[PDB]
Amino acid sequence: AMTAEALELGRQQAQLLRRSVRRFSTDPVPGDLVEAAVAEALTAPAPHHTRPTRFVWLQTPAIRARLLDRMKDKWRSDLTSDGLPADAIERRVARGQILYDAPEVVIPMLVPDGAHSYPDAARTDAEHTMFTVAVGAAVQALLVALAVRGLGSCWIGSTIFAADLVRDELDLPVDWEPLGAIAIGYADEPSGLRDPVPAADLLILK
Amino acid sequence: MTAEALELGRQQAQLLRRSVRRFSTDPVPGDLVEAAVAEALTAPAPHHTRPTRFVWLQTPAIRARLLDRMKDKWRSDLTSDGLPADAIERRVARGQILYDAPEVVIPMLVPDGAHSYPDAARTDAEHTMFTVAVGAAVQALLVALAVRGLGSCWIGSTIFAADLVRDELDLPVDWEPLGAIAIGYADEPSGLRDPVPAADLLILK
């Protein structure tokens, strides 16, 4: 009976292991864990007869660094265009350092695999939104799949703001849409489990 | 034993999740839905934002009026496309799941904490980022339900009828529906998933 109690509790802990981890240890990440975790991630739901998600694992360090630097130069240009002071700009661009330092980086991407073709913008946009939600679901499933294998992770939206650069740098076709980036590694400092608070104003009753 | 079982439990969690199409008539305890929604909101979000709201349609007459209005739009959209009546009916029938489900919860995007940009490019990017985050919250809900013994299915249909959903639920223009989640005890139990290798869905660069 204790074993059954432990099994149930484990199941109800899986997603509470998931932290948006900012600092990783230098330990190397076994490739087998990433591959398995991505296979688990792709169990997330998808619209009928579609494959909205692709994961793009940036294994080549020089390709990763080139992409990140171009993204940073753009981010810097945008913020300087907004008239922020240099200290505010460096503070903000510093938040993307995690992608430089991360042992592994995977970019989730939307692709229109199985998408229905509509003649009108409204249903076209709707389909595209629907595909976007599905990639989002696979992102969570990846983050959890990693946590359950002892791997910390963090999803960051930054690639969404530089999609053309991402397609250019990775030589991907125009309909591949990046939906952020996922840093992966062993957490530098261990963390306790989440103990979620009630939904309160985030759950609406009708 | 318990050390092992805890490890195994954690490993099983996402593998319990199925897109369940048929539910029992067993009523769903409210407490489990509420707890599942609390766990769903552990999904990641951009710094200092709260992209997601879950809108639990507890009142049956409201749920049926909303679905009815969506079905009406969907029918006339397809009639306009020139589909035959029987094909229209076949497609429309796929929506029956939301009528029949013991519980229906709508995931929604709200710009809580969105950054205000003067330009369309970053504005759309922010919006896409919020959308991704709601999808993450959706998976988390489906899994949080599964680990409490509850099946679920996410359907995209409300995305195609956003003004109707806001009109029928009296929500402000900036609340955006991102489908619908039907909830219940599965009619047939299901084994743990055994996920296949990623194959051509994982690209190495």
Side-chain angles (χ1 to χ4, degrees), chain A residues 1-21 24-31 33-76 78-94 96-188 190-206, chain B residues 2-3 5-6 8-20 23-93 95-205:
Chain A
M2 206 159 318
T3 305
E5 288 260 50
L7 179 78
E8 191 98 290
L9 178 55
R11 291 178 174 190
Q12 300 175 358
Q13 279 182 343
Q15 300 200 105
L16 310 180
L17 286 168
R18 202 214 63 78
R19 290 279 156 144
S20 294
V21 171
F24 302 104
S25 88
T26 57
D27 291 1
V29 175
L33 304 181
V34 174
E35 297 193 274
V38 169
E40 179 166 332
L42 295 157
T43 68
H48 196 58
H49 288 152
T50 64
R51 307 195 302 164
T53 302
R54 293 296 184 283
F55 287 98
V56 182
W57 188 356
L58 303 185
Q59 299 183 321
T60 313
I63 290 177
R64 191 214 296 195
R66 266 202 312 273
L67 179 53
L68 293 180
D69 298 344
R70 288 177 79 191
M71 282 171 61
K72 181 198 288 175
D73 289 344
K74 184 173 159 57
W75 197 5
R76 267 207 190 96
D78 290 349
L79 297 174
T80 57
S81 284
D82 295 338
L84 280 50
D87 51 62
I89 296 165
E90 293 312 313
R91 194 145 61 255
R92 282 171 215 208
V93 301
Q97 186 54 36
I98 180 168
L99 300 185
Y100 283 92
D101 292 345
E104 309 287 349
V105 173
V106 178
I107 300 162
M109 304 201 67
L110 178 154
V111 301
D113 179 351
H116 194 287
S117 296
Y118 294 105
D120 62 285
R123 293 182 290 173
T124 298
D125 291 353
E127 193 89 353
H128 181 258
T129 297
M130 174 167 61
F131 274 51
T132 307
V133 178
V135 179
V139 171
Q140 172 71 358
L142 177 55
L143 304 180
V144 179
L146 291 166
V148 146
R149 298 174 167 75
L151 286 173
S153 67
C154 188
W155 169 79
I156 290 143
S158 65
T159 63
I160 296 177
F161 290 83
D164 283 334
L165 271 54
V166 177
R167 283 189 283 275
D168 186 60
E169 196 62 48
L170 312 186
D171 301 317
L172 293 174
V174 67
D175 48 13
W176 289 55
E177 294 177 26
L179 284 180
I182 293 162
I184 309 175
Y186 294 104
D188 195 25
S191 207
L193 278 52
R194 296 179 171 280
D195 195 358
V197 298
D201 65 338
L202 307 170
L203 165 64
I204 287 93
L205 306 181
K206 292 277 177 176
Chain B
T2 57
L6 199 80
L8 185 60
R10 289 168 176 195
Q11 298 169 329
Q12 297 175 335
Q14 300 204 102
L15 306 183
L16 289 158
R17 191 217 73 76
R18 306 280 194 168
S19 288
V20 173
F23 309 96
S24 303
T25 52
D26 300 327
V28 171
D31 290 344
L32 297 169
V33 174
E34 283 189 61
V37 168
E39 186 178 320
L41 296 161
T42 72
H47 193 61
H48 285 23
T49 63
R50 306 192 305 159
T52 304
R53 302 291 184 281
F54 292 94
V55 179
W56 185 359
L57 307 175
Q58 298 185 321
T59 309
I62 295 182
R63 191 219 288 197
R65 209 157 46 244
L66 174 56
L67 297 179
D68 285 340
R69 285 182 71 188
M70 290 165 55
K71 188 197 273 181
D72 168 87
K73 176 176 166 62
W74 198 359
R75 283 221 173 94
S76 69
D77 278 355
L78 302 175
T79 300
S80 293
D81 297 340
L83 278 56
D86 72 319
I88 292 165
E89 287 319 314
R90 269 196 304 286
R91 269 147 192 84
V92 162
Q96 193 58 37
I97 190 160
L98 296 186
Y99 284 103
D100 290 348
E103 304 296 345
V104 174
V105 176
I106 307 315
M108 304 203 71
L109 180 148
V110 294
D112 183 347
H115 209 289
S116 287
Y117 291 112
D119 58 289
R122 293 183 288 179
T123 294
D124 295 343
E126 187 97 328
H127 180 260
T128 297
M129 183 169 58
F130 275 51
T131 306
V132 177
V134 178
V138 174
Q139 171 66 10
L141 178 55
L142 301 176
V143 177
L145 292 164
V147 300
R148 296 182 167 71
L150 282 171
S152 55
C153 192
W154 165 81
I155 289 294
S157 53
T158 66
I159 301 163
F160 293 85
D163 290 328
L164 299 188
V165 171
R166 284 183 285 267
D167 191 61
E168 194 62 35
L169 303 178
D170 302 313
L171 299 159
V173 298
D174 46 352
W175 288 54
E176 295 175 27
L178 293 173
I181 302 171
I183 307 174
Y185 289 101
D187 221 332
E188 308 108 53
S190 214
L192 290 152
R193 279 198 128 90
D194 194 13
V196 304
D200 65 324
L201 300 176
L202 171 56
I203 292 94
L204 311 177
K205 238 70 167 72

